[PDB]
């Protein structure tokens, strides 16, 4: 029965800028929440798991934060590569009921 | 009671089973696991399919309490009194209680935690010796003091016991062994054999999680004529004791998780075949985790109206 | 929790209550078909069998405890209380009548 | 570390059923658990699928329930989902994916939510 | 007794039935009397003989009466006569290879 | 409900207590032979 939706759907920043991603929930998804990017015509890779925990082979600039139904991912140097579309993926509820966020575009 | 003696019987007892489906009843009600496989198997024309009931899995505390069991009107339980018991057999000093004495219903394989103690001696209770099939109980007159807890890898738990004290009782109960094996025989102790995780470790419950913690650096000695860590590793696949099936349960609480206990028993095996004989650790049966508390007591209906013959009148 | 006092804690007792008191009047009913109403030793008019392990009164009255002499008496007891329920006391009021 | 290989694309007229395989290779098979998600062609992530190996467990969204069975096969070490009576929405990408747990011979587990290794995708149309 | 027979590196399934329908103590020994596999009530437990790691039985089975054994990679070493025990009732099985 | 209870528990206490508060009396009148009856005469001497 869980909605998902995040208010930040569309944004364009320049090169060198500091983003920040936003991800919104219904009620309290306590923090496990992870964080995907995805480069068109390929599959998506997995960024940050948990919501505080960086992952394997990540860059530092990506930092996760957050509790209860606010969260945010900002990043510090935007780079040529990062141009993705991003989504947040919660999975506290036993037994699963879990979805996607709707995909934000950098 | 007067100068009465009664046959008393601990192995076809009626109260083990009464504890047996109330405590089933008390883990069924109030730890929910959240995948359950139950082998349901409802026809050499037979045919197994698993159940897959899923179920919300919260965390939620859980410490014993004592529990007395009370007679209901027209019947009463009696209670035996003799130090050195032998389990079976005429109990000749023995009185009538209202309600048993105090009883914490643990899990426990390999180990009696948290139990009764005995009053003179370390007692040995079985079946039958000299069977190869039943399981030796094992009663300490003093508690042994186990330390065992999880430091802030999630799943590693040391667990502390004295050593002097567990080699003197260990000398106390191959001291107690050497009455029925003709005191001059070496008795070994071995680690365990095969089986499930749940019976070839001491597995427990603590605080609300799960214990698997070895037990062959207890095991250890041969007898002839400072402190010991052992790994606890906490587990989520189990294997229920209420049924067969297997059990899916939540990852382990963040934190510390405390808990310290008296070791008061013992389950004992021995592998007897064609000498030394070797014991090693078993259980598994909780029957046998209360079978060797409600060892002295026997529920009786009393039947006021009788007949006897006299020279009276009409 | 004044409810829950009185939900598992107050009817479990009087369960029990309403138990012994219908199990006394049932057996003083039991005691009142054989003659004896509400005596404690009451005293029938049914002869004694040479059988049913028949022995001198001071051994019985002077020796045996009560446990040892209902488990010499198990097997035969049925036939003891047919005869005072039956045949003795329906027998005793006709010849009243 | 492990890598997941998928079956070819494939074109289905609705009302059949169509089968896809993926295969996993690099470590033991039973110690993941796997997931099946979709992607439609320009729109975002949907998840469809879990499965836990070493119960053989599999849980559904409540958007298809009823239209998908996920099977895993130990012996051959690969994930099968079978969608019958698909219709015209589910013309997109699969992916499989799977996560670790950790020790889930020994009865270690984890509840891992999120999805680390992933597979190439298989484009379906209906 | 009942006989059965076997080949060389395979498995061989001795069937042990019990007059009830539940799941009761039943132990499996060696012509020497030593544990190969009981249960403990629901956990199966192994004896401590030198099919320590051959031995395994059904689950499953345990609630319909039947505690079978399942041996493989057998070899000549092991043709022998087995015991069941349960239920008060020793059954005896004799495996050929 | 409430009043099931709470009303109800206190009148089947009182009748249950009156009943047993008879039957234990009767049972006294009972020991000394004098069961049933309202008035009964026995052995013992005016002193
Ligand atoms: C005594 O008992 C025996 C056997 O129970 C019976 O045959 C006999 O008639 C009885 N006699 C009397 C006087 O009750």
């Given at each position: 029965?869980?909605?998902?939706?995040?208010?930040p759907?569309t944004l364009?920043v320049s090169?060198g800028e500091?983003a920040?991603?936003s991800?919104?929930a219904?009620?309290?998804?306590?923090?496990?929440?992870?964080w995907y990017?995805?480069?068109?015509?390929?599959?998506?890779?997995?960024?940050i798991?948990?919501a505080?925990?960086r992952?394997?082979?990540?860059?530092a600039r990506f930092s996760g934060?957050?509790s209860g139904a606010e969260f945010?991912?900002?990043?510090?140097?935007?780079?040529?590569?990062?141009?993705?579309?991003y989504?947040?993926?919660?999975?506290?509820?036993?037994?699963?009921?879990?979805?996607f966020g709707q995909?934000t575009?950098? | 009671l007067?100068?009465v003696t009664?046959?008393?019987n601990?192995?076809k007892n009626?109260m083990?089973?009464?504890?047996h489906?109330?405590?089933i009843?008390?883990?069924?009600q109030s730890?929910?696991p959240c995948?359950?496989?139950?082998?349901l198997?409802?026809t050499?024309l037979?045919?197994?399919?698993?159940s897959?009931?899923?179920?919300?899995c919260?965390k939620?505390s859980?410490?014993?309490?004592?529990?007395?069991?009370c007679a209901?009107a027209?019947?009463?339980?009696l209670?035996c009194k003799?130090?050195?018991?032998?389990g079976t057999?005429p109990?000749p000093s023995?009185?009538?209680?209202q309600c048993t004495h105090?009883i914490?219903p643990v899990?426990?394989?390999?180990?009696?935690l948290?139990?009764?103690?005995?009053?003179?001696?370390?007692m040995?209770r079985?079946?039958?010796?000299?069977?190869?099939?039943?399981?030796?109980?094992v009663?300490?007159?003093?508690?042994?003091?186990?330390n065992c807890?999880?430091?802030?890898?999630?799943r590693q738990?040391?667990?502390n016991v004295?050593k002097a004290?567990?080699?003197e009782?260990?000398?106390?109960?191959?001291?107690?062994l050497?009455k029925?094996?003709?005191?001059?025989?070496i008795i070994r102790?071995?680690?365990?054999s095969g089986?499930?995780?749940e019976?070839?470790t001491?597995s427990?419950?603590?605080g609300?999680?799960?214990?698997?913690?070895?037990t062959?650096?207890?095991?250890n000695?041969?007898?002839?004529?400072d402190?010991?860590?052992?790994?606890?590793?906490?587990?989520?696949?189990?294997?229920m004791?209420?049924?067969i099936?297997?059990?899916?349960?939540?990852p382990p609480?963040?934190?510390?998780?405390?808990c310290?206990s008296n070791?008061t028993?013992?389950i004992?095996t021995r592998?007897?075949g064609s000498?030394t004989e070797?014991?090693?650790?078993?259980?598994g049966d909780?029957?046998?985790?209360?079978?060797?508390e409600?060892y002295?007591?026997?529920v009786?209906?009393i039947?006021?109206?009788?007949?006897?013959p006299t020279?009276c009148?009409? | 929790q004044h409810?829950?006092?009185?939900?598992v804690?107050?009817?479990?007792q009087?369960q029990?209550?309403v138990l012994?008191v219908?199990?006394?009047?049932?057996?003083?009913?039991?005691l009142?078909?054989?003659?004896?109403?509400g005596?404690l030793?009451?005293?029938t008019?049914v002869?004694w069998?040479?059988?049913?392990?028949?022995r001198?009164?001071?051994?019985?009255?002077d020796?045996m405890?009560?446990l040892?002499?209902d488990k010499?008496?198990?097997?035969?007891t049925?036939?003891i209380?047919g005869?005072?329920?039956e045949?003795?006391?329906?027998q005793e009021?006709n010849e009243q009548d | 570390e492990v890598?997941?290989?998928?079956s070819?694309?494939?074109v289905?007229?609705?009302?059949?059923s169509?089968?896809?395989?993926?295969?996993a290779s690099?470590?033991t098979?039973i110690?993941?658990?796997?997931?099946?998600v979709?992607?439609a062609?320009?729109?975002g992530?949907?998840?469809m699928?879990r499965?836990?190996?070493?119960?053989?467990v599999?849980?559904?969204?409540p958007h298809?329930?009823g239209?998908?069975?996920?099977?895993?096969?130990?012996?051959?070490?690969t994930?099968?989902?079978?969608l019958?009576?698909?219709r015209?929405?589910?013309?997109?990408?699969?992916?499989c994916?799977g996560?670790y747990?950790?020790?889930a011979?020994?009865g270690?587990?984890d509840?891992?939510?999120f999805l680390?290794h992933?597979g190439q995708?298989?484009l379906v149309?209906? | 007794?009942?006989?059965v027979?076997?080949?060389?590196?395979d498995?061989?399934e001795?069937?042990?039935?019990?007059?009830?329908?539940k799941?009761?103590?039943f132990h499996?020994?060696?012509?020497n009397?030593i544990?190969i596999?009981?249960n403990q009530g629901?956990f199966?437990?192994?004896g401590?003989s030198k099919?320590?790691?051959?031995?395994?039985?059904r689950?499953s089975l345990?609630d319909?009466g039947?505690f079978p054994?399942?041996?493989?990679?057998?070899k000549?070493?092991?043709?022998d006569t087995y015991?069941?025990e349960?239920?008060?009732?020793?059954?005896?099985?004799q495996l050929?290879?």
């Amino acid at each position: 029965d869980i909605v998902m939706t995040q208010s930040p759907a569309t944004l364009s920043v320049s090169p060198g800028e500091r983003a920040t991603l936003s991800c919104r929930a219904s009620e309290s998804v306590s923090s496990d929440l992870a964080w995907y990017q995805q480069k068109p015509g390929q599959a998506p890779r997995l960024l940050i798991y948990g919501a505080s925990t960086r992952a394997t082979g990540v860059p530092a600039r990506f930092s996760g934060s957050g509790s209860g139904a606010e969260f945010t991912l900002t990043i510090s140097s935007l780079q040529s590569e990062d141009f993705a579309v991003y989504y947040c993926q919660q999975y506290n509820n036993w037994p699963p009921r879990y979805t996607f966020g709707q995909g934000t575009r950098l | 009671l007067e100068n009465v003696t009664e046959e008393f019987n601990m192995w076809k007892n009626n109260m083990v089973e009464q504890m047996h489906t109330d405590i089933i009843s008390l883990w069924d009600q109030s730890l929910k696991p959240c995948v359950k496989l139950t082998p349901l198997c409802v026809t050499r024309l037979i045919n197994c399919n698993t159940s897959a009931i899923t179920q919300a899995c919260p965390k939620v505390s859980f410490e014993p309490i004592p529990i007395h069991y009370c007679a209901p009107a027209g019947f009463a339980i009696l209670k035996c009194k003799d130090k050195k018991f032998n389990g079976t057999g005429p109990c000749p000093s023995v009185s009538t209680v209202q309600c048993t004495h105090g009883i914490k219903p643990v899990v426990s394989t390999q180990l009696l935690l948290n139990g009764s103690l005995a009053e003179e001696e370390v007692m040995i209770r079985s079946e039958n010796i000299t069977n190869n099939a039943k399981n030796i109980l094992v009663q300490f007159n003093t508690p042994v003091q186990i330390n065992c807890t999880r430091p802030n890898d999630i799943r590693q738990a040391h667990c502390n016991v004295s050593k002097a004290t567990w080699n003197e009782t260990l000398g106390k109960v191959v001291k107690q062994l050497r009455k029925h094996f003709g005191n001059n025989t070496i008795i070994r102790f071995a680690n365990s054999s095969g089986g499930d995780l749940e019976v070839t470790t001491h597995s427990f419950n603590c605080g609300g999680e799960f214990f698997y913690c070895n037990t062959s650096g207890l095991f250890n000695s041969t007898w002839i004529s400072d402190s010991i860590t052992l790994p606890c590793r906490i587990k989520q696949i189990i294997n229920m004791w209420q049924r067969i099936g297997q059990a899916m349960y939540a990852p382990p609480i963040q934190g510390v998780i405390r808990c310290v206990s008296n070791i008061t028993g013992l389950i004992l095996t021995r592998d007897g075949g064609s000498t030394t004989e070797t014991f090693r650790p078993g259980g598994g049966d909780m029957r046998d985790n209360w079978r060797s508390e409600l060892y002295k007591y026997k529920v009786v209906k009393i039947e006021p109206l009788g007949v006897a013959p006299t020279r009276c009148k009409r | 929790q004044h409810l829950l006092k009185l939900t598992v804690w107050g009817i479990k007792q009087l369960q029990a209550r309403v138990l012994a008191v219908e199990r006394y009047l049932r057996d003083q009913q039991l005691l009142g078909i054989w003659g004896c109403s509400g005596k404690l030793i009451c005293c029938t008019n049914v002869p004694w069998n040479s059988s049913w392990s028949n022995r001198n009164l001071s051994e019985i009255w002077d020796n045996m405890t009560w446990l040892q002499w209902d488990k010499e008496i198990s097997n035969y007891t049925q036939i003891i209380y047919g005869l005072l329920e039956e045949s003795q006391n329906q027998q005793e009021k006709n010849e009243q009548d | 570390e492990v890598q997941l290989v998928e079956s070819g694309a494939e074109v289905k007229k609705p009302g059949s059923s169509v089968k896809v395989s993926c295969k996993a290779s690099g470590d033991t098979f039973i110690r993941y658990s796997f997931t099946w998600v979709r992607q439609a062609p320009g729109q975002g992530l949907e998840w469809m699928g879990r499965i836990i190996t070493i119960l053989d467990v599999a849980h559904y969204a409540p958007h298809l329930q009823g239209r998908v069975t996920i099977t895993a096969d130990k012996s051959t070490s690969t994930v099968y989902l079978e969608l019958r009576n698909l219709r015209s929405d589910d013309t997109a990408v699969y992916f499989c994916a799977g996560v670790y747990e950790g020790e889930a011979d020994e009865g270690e587990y984890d509840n891992n939510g999120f999805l680390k290794h992933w597979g190439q995708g298989t484009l379906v149309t209906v | 007794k009942k006989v059965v027979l076997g080949k060389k590196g395979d498995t061989v399934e001795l069937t042990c039935t019990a007059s009830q329908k539940k799941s009761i103590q039943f132990h499996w020994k060696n012509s020497n009397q030593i544990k190969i596999l009981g249960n403990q009530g629901s956990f199966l437990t192994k004896g401590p003989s030198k099919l320590n790691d051959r031995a395994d039985s059904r689950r499953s089975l345990w609630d319909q009466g039947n505690f079978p054994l399942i041996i493989k990679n057998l070899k000549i070493e092991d043709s022998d006569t087995y015991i069941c025990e349960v239920e008060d009732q020793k059954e005896e099985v004799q495996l050929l290879v």
